[PDB]
């Protein structure tokens, strides 16, 4: 990673806030190969800077993140991975796991890093976008944001494996058994988000939150996060994550997975998504009425 | 950033399906320096991504495996920030220390969390910070006469990796950590710290045999076996043991006792400081602790 030629996001430190800001708004800040690498590198940079006390992750454009979009001679090559997605030959789930687990590993830097992480969600945080967002220590969301994992319906299982740890069993299952999304307001109500300001107030309340955190000594902040993370990680997060990443690979290789891909190839991915969600009445920015 | 054409602390070679990572500071007991965890972590990742590699074999050159611990400018890891944080007569900052020592342990933990099997071969000694590395490996094979343990429990460390109780169980971990005593490789096999403990003349051959039997399996099978076994391992609270133990190691280095050890090492050299620590306990150098 080259801090002078970042491809997917920007880095800027203002006062004590390290702002990591997705920079592909034309693509909904969709996750590409470089996203986890840049995210993890920038988080480490922030961790090591004694003038940084808090990391604020956000996206440009209409929403936080819409989800998923030098490796030659590795298991991660484009050729190896595309061969592993052919339907009419046995695939290798561990070749898939080596690829997908490294996305998740990059995203997990927001959980495991020394310093506090805040994610600001506006608009949408769906599918892969939640594999990032749910790792953050604090999530603040616009009241009218759309948040969930629609590809439970076809083509994914949340690789991060964090829904049960963030929502509890009942509410995680409510979303993962349907692919339904909740509003930012409901995310606050269910405790997925710490607050849900009206969209006109989101930036102001977000800046207030990070300022308050940033006013604290780094040593205190690091200790609080270490203390709290002993309880979080003791819930079996590592296991939830591993098995969910395997499951996501499975979702991308079932008959249902391949039929979705074939639809995306014929009509484009946006239209494949519309046809997935339309029978459920929550296509686009429509609410799921949870 | 690690340069595979200019490695500082260790070497890398793939022979058939075995990625050999071999420590390369033989006359300093392969002592751990800043680049050690960076190189180990990068080379383990490279092995993981190479479809021609099935197993990773870590060993050290010289008389023993590892004797333990020996671009950051403007970071919490700078030489100046860390040196300042070790002054005795001012308040120190345990989180400045944690940021440093946790990143050593993170590099070492790549042997545990990587996709593929890891094997550590111990000859001679694996003591102190050496064990922070070794105990992360999936398989440990040791010369019957090797010396294995954490002598700085006596003064100046607490095992930052935090793995002793996970690898030995409560009673045998406490037996070594309440004393700083070392066990032989033979005892390590009996206690299940090592999977076998060949005579030193047979160590290399038995090691090669073990890694070849592992390498004869498909990569997909191996990765699944490791993932399955690690769910139980990690469910023991390894992450918490490692975090609290890394905090405790910082403390050990900043107590009156820790400062007195460093003052002796600074005045007379580390070797003499170790002499004074271990000779009263009858186990200085390659002597056994008679556990």
Coordinates of C-alpha atoms in Angstrom, one line a residue:
Chain A
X1 CA 0.0 0.0 0.0
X2 CA 1.3 3.5 -1.1
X3 CA -0.1 6.3 1.1
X4 CA 0.5 8.7 -1.8
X5 CA -1.5 6.6 -4.4
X6 CA -4.5 5.2 -2.5
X7 CA -7.1 3.8 -4.9
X8 CA -10.2 3.2 -2.7
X9 CA -10.2 5.7 0.2
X10 CA -8.5 8.8 1.6
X11 CA -6.6 9.4 4.9
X12 CA -6.5 12.7 6.7
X13 CA -5.8 13.6 10.4
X14 CA -7.5 16.7 11.7
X15 CA -6.5 17.5 15.2
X16 CA -6.8 14.1 16.9
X17 CA -9.2 12.4 14.4
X18 CA -8.0 10.1 11.7
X19 CA -10.6 10.2 8.9
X20 CA -10.6 7.2 6.6
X21 CA -13.1 8.1 3.9
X22 CA -14.1 5.8 1.0
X23 CA -13.5 7.4 -2.3
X24 CA -15.5 5.4 -5.0
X25 CA -18.9 7.1 -4.7
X26 CA -19.6 6.4 -8.4
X27 CA -19.6 2.7 -7.4
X28 CA -21.3 3.0 -4.1
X29 CA -17.9 2.6 -2.4
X30 CA -18.1 -1.0 -3.5
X31 CA -15.4 -3.3 -2.0
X32 CA -12.6 -4.3 -4.3
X33 CA -9.3 -6.2 -3.7
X34 CA -7.5 -3.1 -2.5
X35 CA -10.2 -2.1 0.1
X36 CA -9.2 -4.4 2.9
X37 CA -5.5 -3.7 2.3
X38 CA -5.9 0.1 2.4
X39 CA -8.3 -0.1 5.3
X40 CA -5.9 -2.2 7.5
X41 CA -2.8 -0.2 6.5
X42 CA -4.5 3.2 7.3
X43 CA -5.9 1.9 10.7
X44 CA -2.4 0.7 11.7
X45 CA -1.0 4.1 10.6
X46 CA -3.6 5.8 12.8
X47 CA -2.8 3.4 15.7
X48 CA 0.9 4.3 15.5
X49 CA 0.4 8.1 15.3
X50 CA 0.5 9.5 18.9
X51 CA -1.4 12.6 17.7
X52 CA -4.4 10.3 16.7
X53 CA -6.9 9.4 19.4
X54 CA -9.9 8.2 17.3
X55 CA -10.5 6.8 13.8
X56 CA -13.6 7.9 11.9
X57 CA -14.6 5.8 8.9
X58 CA -17.2 7.0 6.4
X59 CA -18.0 7.0 2.7
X60 CA -18.5 9.7 0.0
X61 CA -21.4 9.8 -2.3
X62 CA -25.0 8.7 -1.6
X63 CA -24.1 6.0 1.0
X64 CA -21.5 4.3 3.1
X65 CA -21.0 1.1 1.2
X66 CA -23.1 -1.1 -1.2
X67 CA -21.1 -4.2 -0.6
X68 CA -18.9 -6.3 -2.9
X69 CA -18.3 -5.3 -6.6
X70 CA 0.4 -8.5 -7.6
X71 CA -1.4 -11.9 -6.9
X72 CA -0.1 -13.7 -10.0
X73 CA 1.1 -17.2 -9.1
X74 CA -0.7 -17.0 -5.7
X75 CA -4.0 -18.7 -4.5
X76 CA -5.5 -15.2 -4.8
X77 CA -4.7 -14.7 -8.5
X78 CA -7.7 -13.6 -10.7
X79 CA -7.1 -16.7 -12.8
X80 CA -7.2 -19.1 -9.8
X81 CA -10.2 -17.4 -8.2
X82 CA -12.2 -17.3 -11.5
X83 CA -11.5 -21.0 -12.2
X84 CA -12.8 -21.6 -8.7
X85 CA -16.2 -20.1 -9.6
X86 CA -17.0 -22.3 -12.6
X87 CA -20.2 -24.2 -12.0
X88 CA -19.8 -27.5 -13.8
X89 CA -16.6 -28.7 -12.0
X90 CA -15.8 -29.3 -8.3
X91 CA -14.8 -26.1 -6.6
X92 CA -12.4 -25.8 -3.7
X93 CA -13.9 -24.1 -0.7
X94 CA -10.5 -23.6 0.9
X95 CA -9.2 -21.7 -2.1
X96 CA -12.3 -19.5 -1.6
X97 CA -11.7 -19.3 2.2
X98 CA -8.1 -18.1 1.7
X99 CA -9.5 -15.2 -0.5
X100 CA -12.6 -14.2 1.5
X101 CA -11.0 -14.5 5.0
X102 CA -8.5 -11.9 3.9
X103 CA -11.3 -9.4 3.1
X104 CA -12.7 -10.1 6.5
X105 CA -9.2 -9.8 8.1
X106 CA -8.8 -6.3 6.6
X107 CA -12.2 -5.3 7.9
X108 CA -11.5 -6.7 11.4
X109 CA -8.7 -4.2 11.8
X110 CA -11.5 -1.8 13.1
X111 CA -12.3 -4.2 16.0
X112 CA -8.8 -5.4 16.9
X113 CA -6.9 -2.1 16.5
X114 CA -5.7 -0.3 19.6
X115 CA -7.7 2.9 19.2
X116 CA -11.4 3.6 19.1
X117 CA -13.2 3.3 15.7
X118 CA -16.3 5.1 14.7
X119 CA -18.3 4.4 11.5
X120 CA -20.8 7.0 10.2
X121 CA -23.5 5.4 8.0
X122 CA -25.6 7.6 5.8
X123 CA -27.8 6.4 3.0
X124 CA -27.1 2.6 2.7
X125 CA -24.9 0.2 4.5
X126 CA -25.8 -3.1 2.9
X127 CA -24.4 -6.6 2.2
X128 CA -20.5 -6.4 2.3
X129 CA -20.8 -2.8 3.7
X130 CA -22.0 -4.3 7.0
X131 CA -19.0 -6.7 7.0
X132 CA -17.0 -3.5 7.5
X133 CA -19.3 -1.4 9.6
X134 CA -20.2 -4.0 12.3
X135 CA -16.5 -4.3 13.2
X136 CA -16.3 -0.7 14.3
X137 CA -16.5 0.2 18.0
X138 CA -19.2 2.8 17.5
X139 CA -21.8 3.0 14.7
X140 CA -23.7 6.2 14.2
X141 CA -26.4 6.2 11.4
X142 CA -28.7 8.6 9.7
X143 CA -32.3 7.9 10.9
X144 CA -33.3 7.0 7.3
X145 CA -30.3 4.8 6.4
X146 CA -30.9 1.3 5.0
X147 CA -28.9 -1.4 6.9
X148 CA -28.9 -5.1 6.4
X149 CA -27.7 -8.1 4.4
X150 CA -30.0 -8.7 1.4
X151 CA -27.7 -11.4 -0.2
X152 CA -28.9 -13.9 2.4
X153 CA -31.7 -14.2 -0.2
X154 CA -29.1 -15.4 -2.7
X155 CA -25.3 -15.2 -3.3
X156 CA -24.0 -14.5 0.3
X157 CA -23.8 -15.3 4.0
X158 CA -22.3 -12.4 6.0
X159 CA -18.6 -13.3 6.1
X160 CA -17.9 -11.1 9.1
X161 CA -20.2 -13.3 11.2
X162 CA -21.0 -10.4 13.5
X163 CA -24.8 -10.1 13.4
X164 CA -25.5 -12.3 16.5
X165 CA -22.7 -10.6 18.4
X166 CA -24.1 -7.1 17.6
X167 CA -27.9 -7.8 17.8
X168 CA -28.4 -10.9 19.8
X169 CA -29.9 -14.2 18.5
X170 CA -33.6 -13.0 17.8
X171 CA -32.8 -9.9 15.9
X172 CA -29.9 -11.3 14.0
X173 CA -32.0 -14.2 12.9
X174 CA -34.9 -11.8 12.0
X175 CA -32.6 -10.1 9.4
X176 CA -30.6 -13.1 8.2
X177 CA -33.7 -15.4 7.8
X178 CA -35.2 -12.7 5.4
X179 CA -32.5 -10.5 4.0
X180 CA -34.6 -7.6 5.3
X181 CA -33.0 -4.2 6.2
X182 CA -33.7 -2.0 9.1
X183 CA -33.7 1.8 9.2
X184 CA -31.0 3.8 11.0
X185 CA -33.6 4.7 13.6
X186 CA -34.3 1.0 14.2
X187 CA -30.6 0.2 14.3
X188 CA -30.3 2.7 17.2
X189 CA -33.4 1.1 18.9
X190 CA -31.9 -2.4 18.5
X191 CA -28.5 -1.2 19.8
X192 CA -26.6 -1.8 16.5
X193 CA -26.0 1.9 16.4
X194 CA -25.3 4.2 19.4
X195 CA -27.5 7.0 18.0
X196 CA -29.5 7.7 14.8
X197 CA -29.7 11.5 14.1
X198 CA -31.9 12.9 11.4
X199 CA -29.9 13.0 8.2
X200 CA -29.5 16.8 8.4
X201 CA -27.9 16.5 11.8
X202 CA -25.7 13.4 11.2
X203 CA -22.5 15.1 10.4
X204 CA -22.8 17.5 13.4
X205 CA -23.6 14.7 15.9
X206 CA -20.8 12.5 14.4
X207 CA -18.2 15.3 14.8
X208 CA -19.5 15.8 18.4
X209 CA -19.1 12.1 19.2
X210 CA -15.5 11.9 17.8
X211 CA -14.5 15.1 19.4
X212 CA -15.6 13.8 22.9
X213 CA -13.7 10.6 22.3
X214 CA -10.7 12.5 21.0
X215 CA -10.7 14.7 24.1
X216 CA -9.7 11.6 26.1
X217 CA -6.0 10.4 26.7
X218 CA -4.9 7.7 24.3
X219 CA -3.8 5.5 27.2
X220 CA -7.3 5.6 28.8
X221 CA -9.0 4.9 25.4
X222 CA -6.7 1.9 24.7
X223 CA -7.4 0.5 28.2
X224 CA -11.1 0.9 27.9
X225 CA -11.1 -0.9 24.5
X226 CA -8.9 -3.7 25.8
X227 CA -11.2 -4.2 28.8
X228 CA -14.4 -4.2 26.7
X229 CA -12.9 -6.5 24.0
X230 CA -12.2 -9.3 26.5
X231 CA -16.0 -9.8 26.9
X232 CA -16.7 -9.3 23.1
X233 CA -14.1 -11.8 21.9
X234 CA -15.1 -14.3 24.6
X235 CA -18.5 -14.6 22.9
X236 CA -16.8 -16.7 20.1
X237 CA -16.4 -14.0 17.5
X238 CA -13.4 -15.8 15.8
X239 CA -15.5 -18.9 15.3
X240 CA -18.6 -17.0 14.1
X241 CA -16.4 -15.3 11.6
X242 CA -14.6 -18.4 10.3
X243 CA -17.7 -20.5 9.8
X244 CA -19.6 -17.6 8.2
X245 CA -16.8 -17.0 5.7
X246 CA -16.9 -20.6 4.7
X247 CA -20.7 -20.2 4.4
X248 CA -20.3 -17.2 2.2
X249 CA -18.2 -19.2 -0.2
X250 CA -20.9 -21.9 -0.2
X251 CA -23.5 -19.3 -1.0
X252 CA -21.5 -18.2 -4.0
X253 CA -21.3 -21.8 -5.3
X254 CA -24.7 -23.3 -4.8
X255 CA -27.1 -23.7 -7.7
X256 CA -28.9 -20.6 -6.4
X257 CA -25.6 -18.7 -6.3
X258 CA -24.7 -19.6 -9.9
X259 CA -28.3 -18.7 -11.1
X260 CA -27.9 -15.2 -9.6
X261 CA -24.5 -14.8 -11.3
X262 CA -25.9 -15.9 -14.6
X263 CA -28.7 -13.3 -14.2
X264 CA -26.1 -10.6 -13.3
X265 CA -24.1 -11.5 -16.5
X266 CA -27.1 -11.3 -18.7
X267 CA -28.8 -8.2 -17.3
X268 CA -26.2 -6.5 -15.2
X269 CA -25.7 -6.7 -11.4
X270 CA -28.0 -3.8 -10.5
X271 CA -30.9 -5.5 -12.4
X272 CA -30.0 -8.9 -10.8
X273 CA -30.3 -7.1 -7.4
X274 CA -33.6 -5.5 -8.3
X275 CA -35.1 -8.8 -9.3
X276 CA -33.9 -10.4 -6.1
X277 CA -35.5 -7.8 -3.9
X278 CA -38.6 -6.9 -5.9
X279 CA -40.7 -9.9 -4.9
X280 CA -40.0 -8.9 -1.3
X281 CA -41.2 -5.3 -1.8
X282 CA -38.0 -3.7 -0.5
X283 CA -36.0 -3.1 -3.7
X284 CA -34.1 0.2 -3.9
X285 CA -34.4 2.5 -0.8
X286 CA -37.8 1.1 0.1
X287 CA -38.1 0.0 3.8
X288 CA -38.6 -3.7 4.7
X289 CA -41.2 -2.9 7.4
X290 CA -39.5 -4.8 10.1
Chain B
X1 CA 8.0 -3.1 4.5
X2 CA 9.8 -6.5 4.2
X3 CA 12.1 -7.1 1.2
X4 CA 12.3 -10.8 0.4
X5 CA 15.7 -10.2 -1.4
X6 CA 17.2 -8.6 1.7
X7 CA 15.9 -10.3 4.8
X8 CA 17.6 -9.2 8.0
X9 CA 16.7 -11.8 10.7
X10 CA 15.8 -15.1 8.9
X11 CA 15.9 -16.9 5.6
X12 CA 13.1 -18.3 3.4
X13 CA 13.3 -21.3 1.1
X14 CA 10.7 -23.6 -0.5
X15 CA 11.8 -27.2 -1.1
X16 CA 9.1 -29.2 -2.7
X17 CA 6.1 -28.4 -0.5
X18 CA 7.9 -27.2 2.6
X19 CA 8.5 -23.5 3.3
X20 CA 11.5 -23.3 5.5
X21 CA 11.8 -20.2 7.6
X22 CA 15.1 -20.3 9.4
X23 CA 16.4 -17.7 11.9
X24 CA 19.6 -16.1 10.8
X25 CA 21.4 -14.5 13.8
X26 CA 23.2 -17.6 15.1
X27 CA 25.8 -16.0 17.4
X28 CA 23.2 -13.9 19.2
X29 CA 21.0 -16.9 19.9
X30 CA 18.6 -15.8 17.1
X31 CA 17.6 -13.0 19.5
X32 CA 14.4 -11.2 18.6
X33 CA 14.8 -7.7 17.1
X34 CA 12.3 -5.2 15.7
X35 CA 12.2 -6.7 12.2
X36 CA 11.8 -10.3 13.5
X37 CA 8.0 -10.3 13.9
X38 CA 7.6 -8.3 10.6
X39 CA 9.7 -10.8 8.6
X40 CA 8.1 -13.9 10.2
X41 CA 4.6 -12.6 9.6
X42 CA 5.4 -11.7 5.9
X43 CA 7.0 -15.0 5.2
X44 CA 4.2 -17.0 6.8
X45 CA 1.7 -15.0 4.6
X46 CA 3.8 -15.7 1.5
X47 CA 3.8 -19.5 2.3
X48 CA 0.0 -19.3 2.9
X49 CA -0.5 -17.8 -0.6
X50 CA 1.8 -20.2 -2.5
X51 CA -0.3 -23.1 -3.7
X52 CA 2.9 -25.2 -4.0
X53 CA 3.4 -24.9 -0.2
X54 CA 1.7 -27.3 2.2
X55 CA 3.6 -26.9 5.4
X56 CA 5.8 -24.3 7.1
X57 CA 8.9 -25.3 9.0
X58 CA 10.5 -22.8 11.4
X59 CA 14.0 -23.5 12.9
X60 CA 17.1 -21.5 14.0
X61 CA 20.7 -21.6 13.0
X62 CA 23.6 -21.8 15.6
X63 CA 23.6 -23.5 18.9
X64 CA 19.9 -23.1 19.6
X65 CA 16.5 -22.2 18.3
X66 CA 16.0 -18.8 20.1
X67 CA 17.3 -17.2 23.3
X68 CA 14.5 -14.5 23.4
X69 CA 14.5 -10.7 23.2
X70 CA 17.6 -8.6 22.5
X71 CA 10.5 4.3 9.7
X72 CA 9.2 4.4 13.3
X73 CA 10.2 8.0 13.7
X74 CA 7.3 10.1 14.8
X75 CA 5.3 7.0 15.9
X76 CA 4.6 5.5 19.2
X77 CA 7.2 2.8 18.3
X78 CA 10.1 5.3 17.8
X79 CA 13.3 4.5 19.6
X80 CA 13.1 7.8 21.5
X81 CA 9.5 7.3 22.6
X82 CA 10.2 3.8 23.8
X83 CA 13.5 4.7 25.5
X84 CA 11.8 7.6 27.3
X85 CA 9.1 5.1 28.4
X86 CA 11.8 3.0 30.2
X87 CA 13.2 5.7 32.5
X88 CA 12.8 4.6 36.2
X89 CA 12.3 8.0 37.9
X90 CA 9.2 9.3 36.0
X91 CA 5.8 7.8 35.4
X92 CA 5.8 5.4 32.5
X93 CA 3.0 4.6 30.1
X94 CA 1.9 0.9 30.0
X95 CA -0.1 1.5 26.8
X96 CA 2.8 3.0 24.9
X97 CA 4.5 -0.3 26.0
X98 CA 1.5 -2.4 25.0
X99 CA 1.5 -0.9 21.5
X100 CA 5.1 -2.1 21.1
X101 CA 5.0 -5.5 22.8
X102 CA 1.6 -6.5 21.3
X103 CA 3.1 -6.1 17.8
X104 CA 5.9 -8.6 18.6
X105 CA 3.3 -11.0 19.8
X106 CA 1.1 -10.3 16.7
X107 CA 3.9 -11.2 14.4
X108 CA 4.6 -14.4 16.3
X109 CA 0.9 -15.4 16.4
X110 CA 1.0 -15.7 12.6
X111 CA 2.2 -19.3 13.2
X112 CA -1.2 -20.0 15.0
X113 CA -3.6 -18.1 12.8
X114 CA -2.2 -18.8 9.3
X115 CA -4.1 -21.1 7.0
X116 CA -1.4 -23.8 6.7
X117 CA 0.3 -26.1 9.3
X118 CA 3.3 -24.7 11.1
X119 CA 6.0 -26.9 12.6
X120 CA 8.8 -25.6 14.9
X121 CA 12.0 -27.5 15.4
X122 CA 13.8 -26.8 18.6
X123 CA 17.4 -27.8 19.2
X124 CA 19.7 -26.5 22.0
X125 CA 17.6 -23.9 23.7
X126 CA 14.1 -22.3 23.3
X127 CA 13.9 -19.9 26.2
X128 CA 12.2 -16.7 27.2
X129 CA 11.0 -14.8 24.2
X130 CA 11.9 -17.8 22.1
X131 CA 8.9 -19.6 23.6
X132 CA 6.6 -16.7 22.7
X133 CA 7.4 -17.7 19.1
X134 CA 7.6 -21.5 19.4
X135 CA 4.3 -22.1 21.4
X136 CA 2.3 -20.5 18.6
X137 CA 3.4 -23.3 16.2
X138 CA 0.9 -26.1 15.4
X139 CA 3.5 -28.8 16.0
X140 CA 6.6 -28.6 18.2
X141 CA 9.4 -31.1 17.8
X142 CA 12.4 -30.9 20.1
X143 CA 15.7 -32.5 20.8
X144 CA 15.4 -34.7 23.9
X145 CA 18.2 -32.5 25.5
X146 CA 16.8 -29.1 24.5
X147 CA 16.2 -26.5 27.3
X148 CA 12.7 -25.0 27.2
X149 CA 11.1 -22.5 29.5
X150 CA 10.7 -18.8 30.6
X151 CA 13.6 -17.8 32.9
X152 CA 12.6 -14.1 33.0
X153 CA 9.7 -15.0 35.2
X154 CA 12.4 -14.6 37.9
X155 CA 12.8 -11.0 36.8
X156 CA 12.2 -8.8 33.7
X157 CA 9.4 -10.6 31.9
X158 CA 6.0 -12.3 31.9
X159 CA 5.5 -14.5 28.8
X160 CA 3.7 -12.0 26.5
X161 CA 2.4 -14.7 24.2
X162 CA 0.3 -16.0 27.1
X163 CA 0.2 -19.6 25.8
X164 CA 1.7 -21.6 28.7
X165 CA -1.6 -22.6 30.3
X166 CA -3.2 -23.3 26.9
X167 CA -0.3 -25.6 25.9
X168 CA 0.5 -27.3 29.3
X169 CA -2.7 -26.9 31.4
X170 CA -2.8 -25.0 34.7
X171 CA -0.6 -27.1 36.9
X172 CA 2.4 -27.5 34.6
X173 CA 2.2 -23.9 33.3
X174 CA 2.3 -22.7 37.0
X175 CA 5.2 -25.1 37.8
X176 CA 7.3 -23.3 35.2
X177 CA 6.0 -19.8 35.6
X178 CA 6.2 -19.7 39.4
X179 CA 9.9 -20.7 39.2
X180 CA 11.4 -19.7 35.8
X181 CA 12.6 -23.3 35.6
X182 CA 13.1 -25.0 32.2
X183 CA 12.2 -28.5 31.1
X184 CA 14.2 -30.8 28.8
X185 CA 12.7 -31.7 25.3
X186 CA 12.1 -35.1 26.6
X187 CA 9.9 -33.7 29.4
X188 CA 8.2 -31.4 26.9
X189 CA 7.1 -34.5 24.9
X190 CA 5.9 -36.2 28.1
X191 CA 3.9 -33.0 29.1
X192 CA 2.5 -32.7 25.5
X193 CA 4.3 -29.3 24.8
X194 CA 6.1 -31.2 22.0
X195 CA 4.7 -33.9 19.9
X196 CA 7.9 -35.9 20.0
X197 CA 11.4 -35.5 21.4
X198 CA 14.0 -37.4 19.3
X199 CA 17.6 -37.8 20.5
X200 CA 19.6 -34.8 19.1
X201 CA 21.3 -37.0 16.5
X202 CA 17.9 -38.0 15.1
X203 CA 16.1 -34.6 15.3
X204 CA 16.6 -33.5 11.8
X205 CA 15.6 -36.8 10.2
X206 CA 12.5 -37.1 12.4
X207 CA 11.6 -33.5 11.7
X208 CA 12.0 -34.0 7.9
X209 CA 9.8 -37.2 8.2
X210 CA 7.1 -35.3 10.1
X211 CA 6.9 -32.4 7.6
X212 CA 6.9 -34.7 4.6
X213 CA 4.0 -36.7 6.0
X214 CA 2.1 -33.4 6.6
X215 CA 3.2 -32.2 3.1
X216 CA 1.9 -35.3 1.4
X217 CA -1.7 -34.2 2.3
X218 CA -3.8 -32.0 0.1
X219 CA -3.7 -28.3 1.1
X220 CA -7.5 -28.1 1.3
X221 CA -7.6 -31.0 3.8
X222 CA -4.9 -29.4 5.9
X223 CA -6.5 -26.0 6.0
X224 CA -9.8 -27.5 7.1
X225 CA -8.2 -29.7 9.8
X226 CA -6.4 -26.6 11.2
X227 CA -9.6 -24.5 11.1
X228 CA -11.6 -27.2 12.9
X229 CA -9.0 -27.7 15.7
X230 CA -8.5 -23.9 16.2
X231 CA -12.2 -23.4 17.0
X232 CA -11.5 -25.4 20.3
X233 CA -8.1 -23.7 20.8
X234 CA -9.3 -20.2 20.4
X235 CA -12.5 -20.9 22.5
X236 CA -10.1 -21.4 25.6
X237 CA -9.6 -17.5 25.8
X238 CA -6.2 -17.4 24.1
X239 CA -6.8 -13.8 23.0
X240 CA -7.4 -12.6 26.5
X241 CA -4.4 -14.6 27.9
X242 CA -2.2 -12.9 25.3
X243 CA -3.5 -9.4 26.0
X244 CA -3.2 -9.6 29.8
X245 CA 0.1 -11.3 29.6
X246 CA 1.5 -8.7 27.2
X247 CA 0.4 -6.0 29.8
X248 CA 2.1 -7.9 32.6
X249 CA 5.4 -8.2 30.6
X250 CA 5.4 -4.4 30.3
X251 CA 5.0 -4.3 34.1
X252 CA 7.8 -6.8 34.7
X253 CA 10.1 -4.6 32.7
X254 CA 9.2 -1.5 34.8
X255 CA 9.1 -2.7 38.4
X256 CA 11.9 -2.0 40.8
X257 CA 13.1 -5.6 40.1
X258 CA 13.0 -5.1 36.3
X259 CA 14.9 -1.9 36.4
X260 CA 17.5 -3.5 38.7
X261 CA 18.0 -6.3 36.2
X262 CA 18.5 -3.8 33.3
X263 CA 20.9 -1.7 35.4
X264 CA 23.0 -4.8 35.9
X265 CA 22.8 -5.7 32.2
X266 CA 23.7 -2.1 31.2
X267 CA 26.7 -2.0 33.6
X268 CA 28.1 -5.5 33.0
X269 CA 26.4 -6.9 29.9
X270 CA 23.3 -9.1 29.6
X271 CA 25.3 -12.3 30.0
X272 CA 26.4 -11.4 33.5
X273 CA 23.0 -10.2 34.4
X274 CA 21.6 -13.6 33.3
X275 CA 24.4 -15.4 35.3
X276 CA 23.4 -13.6 38.5
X277 CA 19.7 -14.4 37.9
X278 CA 20.2 -18.2 37.1
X279 CA 23.3 -19.3 39.0
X280 CA 21.6 -19.1 42.4
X281 CA 18.9 -21.5 40.9
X282 CA 21.5 -24.0 39.7
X283 CA 20.4 -23.9 36.1
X284 CA 22.6 -21.2 34.4
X285 CA 23.4 -21.9 30.7
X286 CA 22.5 -25.4 29.4
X287 CA 22.1 -26.8 32.9
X288 CA 18.8 -28.6 33.6
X289 CA 16.4 -27.3 36.2
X290 CA 15.6 -30.8 37.5
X291 CA 11.8 -30.4 37.3

